[model samples]
Target: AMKLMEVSPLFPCIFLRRVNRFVGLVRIKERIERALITNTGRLNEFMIPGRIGYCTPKAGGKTRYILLGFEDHGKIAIIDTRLQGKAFEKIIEKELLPELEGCRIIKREPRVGESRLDYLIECSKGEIFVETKSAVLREGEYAMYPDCPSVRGQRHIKELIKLARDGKRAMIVFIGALPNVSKFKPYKKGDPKIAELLKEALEAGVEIRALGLHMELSGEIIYRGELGVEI
Candidate 1:
């Protein structure tokens, strides 16, 4: 029941087809328009043809609409990857993470070692470097990360491993915005490299946490609970 963020004025839309990885054609009010997809990960199940979704109009941008959320089996799935970080920020500010409680956020999107980390936090526990990943693809009750191969994700894990090896606390957080996703696991079949890297990071003492959020039809994203990490 933790409130994260609220977005307003969402326009109803229907998924037609993906013009490209970052762009897709959608129908809004009976007119077909090219919409920018905020998520870069593969969302084959949620982005298929005739899928009901919602979009936000651009305020003088090249892309007419930006895909925000989509419906999946009567539940709202927030697929906006860009907003994932924002939601994380709210969680940190609220001190919702039990592992990171009382941690002070230093600088956001800071460069740590060679790779840029999501957030740098300082606490009595120690300085922690956080890396966040958005998860949307789900099979029944199981949610997985990186629906496709992610070289950048692998690189982030490598940096985190180095940080942990250097005697600093490092953590990777998986943010799942689906209501049905109660557990998270790495998509080993789709991205074996990232999965292996995650295992290596864990052995190196890097912590991993997964959080799930409920996207209400009222446009508010509320924290549901922590998801079980399968990997």
Candidate 2:
């Protein structure tokens, strides 16, 4: 990830720009990387990560989003990269926070032995450790993730199992903008190890989820819906 100099005067507000050379065309629903602007102030939220929107010469002047982090740092997750830092902010502040409602991030980068979980949540009933993956594929009636195999993805599952063995609620959330999938499942053909790991975690009583996002591009600011992943 390459970082770009901040040029927008409205640093905190959302701004979208088209990428000329970095457009990802391998998959229809996937994003390569685009430029985004975040707040001008010093970064605060850590786990929230970042977001971006890249336009293809073919998107008919439309832009597609690629979110960084999960949903804590808003656009900050796209830090040091020439991607949508402000869009991350807009989604988290306007879209995601509203969706999570009363939930709080009890821990960021929660660790179980050598592996680190992303977010730990404590609600009225219990506490849980979460492992998150950004969903990036959209096909007919289906959305898949890790179009590429993630070595870190397997590690996350191993950590979740550790959490479960220690009697903690563990989960993995697949965050995406595609809300139409009937159910969430791993793209095993793409990454058999991830599928196997997730299967083991689920059998061990770790939960899993699929999340969808809402976005609009104006090159000025994008609007987003803050919502959690559903089973």
Candidate 3:
């Protein structure tokens, strides 16, 4: 496994409730604190009140702390999308996975047609347009996507489909940041069209990929390698 990053000094606290879509209230020591939530997904599974959560100091933002995610079972499930994206970059930079051998990120937030993607990767095969999604919603052994309907998610999938149909090297990656999950699946209940669109992208030759990454109590983001993508 590859070590992507270490966000040390993570505070262990009790999750109180999500104050809003972007903020969560938590209890730290004797004080109740508000932490910024970087992920916009509903995160129904992770935001349970009275659950153990992690937070780190933040500055130059609306809040003083950023809620990373909670400790689940024996592992830390990272819910910060920014860190998830960063870990994806590390995977490419380190070339840890054989499937992505000889690949390196050429540009970030690269534009293809009218859609901007998370990465422009130059690989052994060719340049690939890649978009990443965070899948933290866990159900038994599976990690799921979009706890709610995602119009942007659908749009990104559509762009990838178009790129693949045009014979460009296109791909979509789901970051299974939930350590307990061994497979990644599109939650049709979140958006029925997502699973259908993924099938279409497969037919169009767009590569689908998933990987497992979670944080350690010490704040080290460890890559648990690739996972089976169950579209």
Candidate 3 lDDT, tens digit per residue, 1-231? 668888968999999999889899999999999899989898887889999999999876678988998897787998999889988888887778777798888898877766688889887768888999999988888888878888888888999999998889998999999877788889888989988999999999999988998999989999988888887
TM-score of 3: 0.94
Better of 1 and 3 by lDDT: 3
lDDT of 2 by residue, 1-231 (tens): 112123232122222222332322222234233432221212222212232322223222443433222221133222222223233333333335443444556676866777787777665667777666655454444545555567767788888887887888887766543334344456666678887887788778887766444222311232223233222
Ranking by lDDT: 3, 1, 2
Top candidate when judged by lDDT against the true structure: 3
* Model 3 lDDT, residue 3, Cα: 83
2 or 3, which is superior by lDDT?
3
Each candidate structure's TM-score, on Cα atoms with residue i matched to residue i, is 0.93, 0.54, 0.94
